[PDB]
Write a protein that binds this ligand. Structure first.
Ligand SMILES: O=N[O-]
Ligand SMILES: O=N[O-]
Ligand SMILES: O=N[O-]
Ligand SMILES: O=N[O-]
Ligand SMILES: O=N[O-]
Ligand SMILES: O=N[O-]
Ligand SMILES: O=N[O-]
Ligand SMILES: O=N[O-]
Ligand SMILES: O=N[O-]
Ligand SMILES: O=N[O-]
Ligand SMILES: O=N[O-]
Ligand SMILES: O=N[O-]
Ligand SMILES: O=N[O-]
Ligand SMILES: O=N[O-]
Ligand SMILES: O=N[O-]
Ligand SMILES: [Cu+2]
Ligand SMILES: [Cu+2]
Ligand SMILES: [Cu+2]
Ligand SMILES: [Cu+2]
Ligand SMILES: [Cu+2]
Ligand SMILES: [Cu+2]
Lengths: 332, 332, 332
């Protein structure tokens, strides 16, 4: 009887940060209430000033990470304000039935809807917009995010012992297909609708013009680098709603990795690089052992360093010479 | 002594259906006899009427699913009628030696051959044509299919308990590379041979023009949608002889998945999306829990909704509001 | 105390061969000393005579396989002679800290450096050049190789029983992006530096012009085919520093496969084809059961047979008719 379950309202936070949650469930099953507002907005995606009309959940690319526990109910109020121009909806890969909720959530501008589903399978999962006839255009304009359904007793290693993370970050990786003129210059449009047929042609090349973390080239660098300390246990959730990626922590490893993101399976150990298929979210757990700058990349290095799929961690603490040392510094 | 084994002749059926078989073996090892006839034929692959010269086993793309048990012998009579124009052969990834049988099965038009091999490893496996010097042209013209070698005691879950399917379907996914003129219009040819050099150039782009299930855009829709009922256990076998794919059941999951298709390994549980590498067959088991239309796609959504890699299931039965419900229908 | 450990100097050998080593460690932890010299050199990569300026470790593409045991220390002297023109460095995916050693090994022409790291995780791992600002250009010019860190008690199967190989080969697969003129002819340059901006444009297409094993089309064929005998247990180590690949032994299987290459995980059994993500090394173990020629390919067959990613094994011994036989030879 759902009316007798506790309700809890969660306020979401901007990626790469994740809303507060407990890893081990401190209550019984709950109805967990989330609100998201769709925002169509112009986004500058690179250092050259290339602009796209992005379609976002809650104003960010990716949309925010939602966190619940296995056998909670998720109740999402989805709002499409009348300042938007397009029909949108939401498909959760976590959900069962009605095209992951897509059949039930079609909202024109000026409409809202509330969907509830039971989170029956533990794992990280993609969610994304999927309106009939314009699915890849919405998704590759940024309209995707992820949801994490934790086991009620938290994460476990390959031996079934508890794994507890100290910090969690969410990296959404986005392939964009910005249309080009004859000479190869990016085109601009006043409205999302203007771009449509040109967007279709650009997508059909299967060759993204940009592949970015958190919505822009260089988004997770400088003042916005991810931080940790030596000895901290970090979980990085990574999603790609449309195209394969292969994450790699330069200078580290994935100590425990669920590459296809589903926590009933044992993790893969000691990964250098792992493949997350398009349409999937994965999760990697690592304990930092050395201080300094790390780069976190898609290890197609052209995709990383030319197209934008690279971010930084800055890690504080003590250097361990036993793990690595320069014996003779570069010299003639 | 092979002459003392029972022989059984199987008549194959058109994909996505699969010939009758037992999951748990009701006899000892058998010699299982199959006949396939090669047909070169014109195929219309899209809604625009684009035509290719397809090269098929038994008249379909993909070729039919063959089903045997571990340590059966497969005996295939392969017929290349003199109405065809090309040399063909057959490579089974299930087989050991002679390039999977390719070295032994080269048939000019007007020839036939009979190959026997022992099915020593359980799993689903690709088979495909592979004539010396023209391998990718034959395969990407449709000349591929799959064979399932069941364990003698059927499928098992990750705990070694039996998994029994009620229904099985075979989805062959095909990347086509239709040559284009200067402006981007598809070219037409009177014979397969005419297309050769243009086919090579189109393949070298590594960019398919169409990616389809069961040989055409929209093949597994409408009257030809896959069917099931709530509560049915369905196994979907999916192959891709040349290029990676990432299947996803929109509104469902892969409850048990062998992404690289080999049944001695435990299945991955609760998958949203899985990667089947090119040159592999995989298998996903799901129990339907909700009625309605499901889309089964390659989750590069451009490949699905623009290039053709999408099909439908239509599922009958009772709606379960506990799993999903619309709390407030879309309204202003 | 590192000064009290034995030191052993290893002389490396050219791929696809691997330096002598023990599978089960016959000593305690050691400091294992390697020397590599960077060579920038012109390489002819195809039958047409296309030339590139390759950037190599030790004169080969790929660089040589280094083999150590878990918890050995690796000490590498890296030499950049003054006949080279570029700055180089080395990132080991096996290592922890300082961008896998990349931050500590930047050598201008005429400089050398010595790095030491502890090999704390068992598996095969990529190493590659990674100079700030020019990472994918160095890697896709050939500057990558692999290192194998064996468990101290050797390899194990999925049940934890020993697996011993008789022979080991290293296949480095390389994606090249040779710049083209307007008509599609490959360009030539006097120096590596000349090619830079054209190289960047060619990489951004994400479409390699060549994909080769051991540095050239046809490198592992003819007199240079890999050899084995019926009954031999062969380990093939395969790396791809930048782009996904899907190896397949035509006429065989991967009996035990670590597709992402990390030996603390159980192997996948009976694989037809496996996916090694870009930025990873994998390893496949197979026992040959039939004599003859086998082709070892990336099973995107266009990548294999049109772009160059195919090699041969030649296997001697007795034919087994029980596994495969021609019942009726091709005839009218
Ligand atoms: O836009 N409806 O609140
Ligand atoms: O789906 N493309 O990686
Ligand atoms: O092809 N996926 O990066
Ligand atoms: O080691 N990162 O390319
Ligand atoms: O799918 N879980 O790794
Ligand atoms: O075409 N031979 O039956
Ligand atoms: O093999 N291409 O996915
Ligand atoms: O790249 N394979 O869809
Ligand atoms: O949820 N299907 O894209
Ligand atoms: O390879 N079997 O999942
Ligand atoms: O190039 N220094 O030995
Ligand atoms: O990273 N491309 O397969
Ligand atoms: O896309 N990798 O072959
Ligand atoms: O069976 N090799 O394509
Ligand atoms: O990652 N080891 O298969
Ligand atoms: Cu939308
Ligand atoms: Cu989806
Ligand atoms: Cu053929
Ligand atoms: Cu094959
Ligand atoms: Cu270099
Ligand atoms: Cu790397």
């Amino acid at each position: 009887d759902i009316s007798t379950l506790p309700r809890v309202k969660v306020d979401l936070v901007k990626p790469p940060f994740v809303h507060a949650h407990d890893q081990v469930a401190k209550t019984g099953p709950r109805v967990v209430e989330f609100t998201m507002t769709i925002e169509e907005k112009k986004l500058v995606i690179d250092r050259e000033g290339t602009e796209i009309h992005a379609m976002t959940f809650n104003g960010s690319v990716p949309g925010p990470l939602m966190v619940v526990h296995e056998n909670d109910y998720v109740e999402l109020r989805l709002i499409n304000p009348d300042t938007n121009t397009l029909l949108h909806n939401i498909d959760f890969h976590a959900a069962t039935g009605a095209l992951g909720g897509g059949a039930l959530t079609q909202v024109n501008p000026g409409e809202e809807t509330t969907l509830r589903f039971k989170a029956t399978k533990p794992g990280v999962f993609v969610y994304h917009c999927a309106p009939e006839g314009m699915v890849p255009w919405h998704v590759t304009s940024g309209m995707n995010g992820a949801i994490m359904v934790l086991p009620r007793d938290g994460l476990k290693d390959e031996k079934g012992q508890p794994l507890t993370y100290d910090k969690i970050y969410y990296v959404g990786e986005q392939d964009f297909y910005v249309p080009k003129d004859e000479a190869g210059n990016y085109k601009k449009y006043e409205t999302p609708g203007e771009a449509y047929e040109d967007a279709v042609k650009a997508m059909r090349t299967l060759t993204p013009t940009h592949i970015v973390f958190n919505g822009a080239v260089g988004a997770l660098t400088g003042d916005h680098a991810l931080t940790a300390a030596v000895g901290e246990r970090v979980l990085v959730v990574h999603s790609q709603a449309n195209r394969d990626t292969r994450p790699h922590l330069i200078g580290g490893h994935g100590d425990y990795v669920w590459a296809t993101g589903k926590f009933r399976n044992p993790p893969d150990l000691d990964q250098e690089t792992w493949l997350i298929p398009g349409g999937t979210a994965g999760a990697a757990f690592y304990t930092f052992r050395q201080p300094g700058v790390y780069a976190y990349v898609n290890h197609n290095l052209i995709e990383a360093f030319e197209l934008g799929a690279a971010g930084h961690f800055k890690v504080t603490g003590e250097w361990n010479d036993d793990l690595m040392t320069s014996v003779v510094k570069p010299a003639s």
